[PDB]
């Protein structure tokens, strides 16, 4: 998926 903090 996608990184939360980037």
């Amino acid at each position, epitope marked *: 998926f*996608e*990184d*939360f*903090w980037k």
Partner: antibody
Amino acid sequence: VQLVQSGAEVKKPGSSVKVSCKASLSSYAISWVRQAPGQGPEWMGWINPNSGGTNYAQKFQGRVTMTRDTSISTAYMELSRLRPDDTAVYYCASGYCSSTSCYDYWGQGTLVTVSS
Amino acid sequence: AVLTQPSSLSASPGASVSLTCTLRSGINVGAYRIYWYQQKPGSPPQFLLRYKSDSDKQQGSGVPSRFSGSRDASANAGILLISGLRSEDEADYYCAIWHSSAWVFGGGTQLTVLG
């Protein structure tokens, strides 16, 4: 399910502290956020668990080190040459986002008290 | 003063409330995903939702629908909306953006629910 941090710390101004954040790791970045008493959150940086690559906020660049041990799957945050202003609850956090929703995970937090 | 929030807001249960996260002029709200968090005393901040537009929004896992994002180009302010306004909603509310290669947080809004 869970991030679990180390216990509270008390330090003298000029010393260092090392807080651990053990996953019950991720493939996503573990970010470190602190909150001074009666204040908002303050982002310190993140670490990538696979690479071990870091990205510190400019304020802490110089006196913060973030590491990981993928064997035991715990992230560490060491803050050096402590100031009274570094008195805060230090949180570790990580998560991921789809197109639909996001799944964040926070530690319980670690109170670090800095005073003479 | 990148992100600014109102310090306090009070409303009664059942009604809807809007919380603003004002961006400094030049830092256009339309270009950022505004991250919203709820924090009750003693616990870590918990993610509510992130919102850029109606076409670009992600809710928090297990966060009720009554929590919803919005924005306003003229005011240059991201908005969080709460519909149910249960007494459970009484907490501090922080906004955050990824600005100039760093995570910036707001001062926070203390939402009081009248009993």
